[model samples]
Target chain A: MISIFIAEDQQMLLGALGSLLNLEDDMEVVGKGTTGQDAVDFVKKRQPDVCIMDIEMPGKTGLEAAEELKDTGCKIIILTTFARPGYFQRAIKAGVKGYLLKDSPSEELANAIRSVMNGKRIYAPELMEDLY
Target chain B: GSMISIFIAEDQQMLLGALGSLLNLEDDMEVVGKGTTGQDAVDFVKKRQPDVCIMDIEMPGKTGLEAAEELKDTGCKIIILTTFPGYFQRAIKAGVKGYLLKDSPSEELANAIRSVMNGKRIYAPELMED
Candidate 1:
């Protein structure tokens, strides 16, 4: 049972994601949050195996939350709309294990978290080096 | 509600990224996946079976036209691009949803997706022979 936490601004997607991941046999969604600040606090109170977060959030940015959560031994996977190349550098600085494009299928979200939990860093190769 | 899934097949990296952002701005359209090769375009559609496809005519592997032809029976709507009038006429015969020139602004792309999703179709007026 790997515990996973999610941080996304859109309430609908947040709930939808929780429902989807809960369907997994071995995956348990311990916490779900809307704002980045809340997400960081949720993880602080109870750390999880992995955290899936959107880059741009209302309150605190996902990078800020991830930076604060750095030494908690939780892996961070960033899901964003456009792959800002500079963000990968910042994400690496924050110790994000995985980076994925939001346009990818929802299954890819699960795959990223699963791979990161196993201590493997994963990213989809860009279609033409710009979709990042 | 009909779920309109789309795939953008283009070689240029910047346009590819811009196109993704442009399409995702839609509330109804869901971009299931994207690819660079003409073969991957067809393969992705075969797997995802999106309702619409916007492909650059000059992409790698099979042309967008060829890929569109292969997926014609798969129930996917196709939008072919062209910079030449001849290509426009050819796309007409291909039975695609819309035909736009390369210089066509990104807004037309959005409109085409919406028009196709609504069970109505759109094409460049100048290219319409009838």
Candidate 2:
């Protein structure tokens, strides 16, 4: 099973996402955190296969956490509601494997996780259209 | 078993779907309808009249506060589910029965729905003090 860690501030979204991904036959949610600090601390310790990090958490935005975790051997996927160019550019610079919008379909998350695990980069088409 | 009917109006498709799936897991809850726009929520609630409506603040066509204001006489309870704060007065003025944060747990949402159904107003703990 693919071990996944989620870091989203919203408790409801966090719980729902954990439950949703856990339903996948090949996936299991190994850890969950509510803030960017929690994300960096827990992810560094646990080092799950993939970490779904939200952009606007309490301390150290997801991009900052990704920068810190760049050499941790854990692939990072940014899942955020905002499609800001600056955030996307920073995510790319931090070497995050995927950057997806929260508005995407539910299945898109699982697909992105799998894609990133395969050593691929995934970005929201809307963001790509805006930046590139 | 009679289930409480729910209508969700969230612009984020993933969160909307996730909320529906999570609520549906509750034996006492059923998601009767869902929409991505506040106007869609108003029109649907006016017609279908679900027991409770969970609405997002920022959406296309109209805002959730606007929809709640329009549905004042519809008798369907409205809950403004959002990430931001400071809309408590406007929400109450618009006849919203609940003002909950998206950060709240699903169990809290479920309990809020039931509480609203019982003619009790619900708000996030922080909002209550405000």
Candidate 3:
């Protein structure tokens, strides 16, 4: 079973992502958080297989939490609307395995999760173009 | 027992698919068709007439309100779900019988669709507030 933890400031997006992820036969949502710190705290207690997080959030940024999660053996996927080079640089530095745009279709996001589970790093096409 | 065919028009694919699954949970409700743009919604509804059409006010190409206005005369009922309050008055003028916030839980939306199916006009509680 692929257990996931989702963190997004928007309550609707958080709930929606959780619900959609739960619909997958091999996927299950272990926990949900509204802030980066909330995610960090949850991971401290119960480490999920993956963490899908928004880039810009209150309390702490997803990059910071992702950096902390490197040693915890949990995969970090940054999901955000921001396409800035700065955020991408920091996320890459933080060992984030997946970076996807918020505008991408949910099916794409689901596929990305499966790819990340298979030891493949996933990045939005636009972001990947700028990466190398 | 005939299934209640529903047409959905929303720009967000994830939410669109999620809603389709959510509504299908109802014994009588089934999403007959889905569109990512307002024009697609209008064209598909014209081709395959469904009992209910739930649309997002904001969409690529023509807005849902414009589509609603175009489909006003059609027998297919229109329902507008939007996060923007500005679209409320315009959607009402476009002949939509149901107005719901996009953030409302799927259960509430399902109930609103049921009410509208019974010939009752429905509005979200927050939208009704002054």
| Most accurate candidate by lDDT | 2
**Over the stretch A1-132, how does candidate 3's per-residue lDDT look in tens digits?**
899999887554676678788889999999988889988998878988899998878898888888877778788999876566667877888889999876578778778888999999998887766655
Candidate 3 local distance difference test against the native: 0.82
**Docking outcome class, model 2:** high
- In terms of lDDT, which candidate is stronger, 1 or 3? 3
Supply DockQ values for each candidate: 0.04, 0.80, 0.29
lDDT of 2 by residue, B1-130 (tens): 4689999999999899888888998899999998999899988998998999999978998999889989988989998888773567888888898988887886788889989999998988855444
TM-score to native of every candidate shown: 0.51, 0.94, 0.83
Residue by residue across A42-132, what tens digits does model 2's lDDT show? 8888879999999888877887899999888899999888788887777888889998899998878898999999999999998978777
Worst 10 residues of 3 chain B by lDDT: B101-110
Report how large a share of the reference interface contacts model 2 reproduces: 0.82
Residue-level lDDT of model 1, residues B1-130, one tens digit each, is 5557888786544345446655665687777777777898889888887888888777767888777767777787888765445665566577777776654444567777788777676775545455
DockQ (0 to 1) for model 3: 0.29
List, residue by residue over B1-130, the lDDT tens digit for candidate 3. 4678999898877667767767777898999888989999889889999999999888889999899999988888888877655677777788899987755555677788788889999987766656
Alpha-carbon shift of residue B82 in model 2 (angstroms)? 1.6
Across A12-122, the per-residue lDDT of candidate 1 in tens digits comes to 345556666777788998987777898789888888888988888888999888888888888888877676776777887889898877556666667777888889987
Q: Please give the range of 10 consecutive residues that has the lowest summed lDDT in model 3 chain A.
A: A10-19
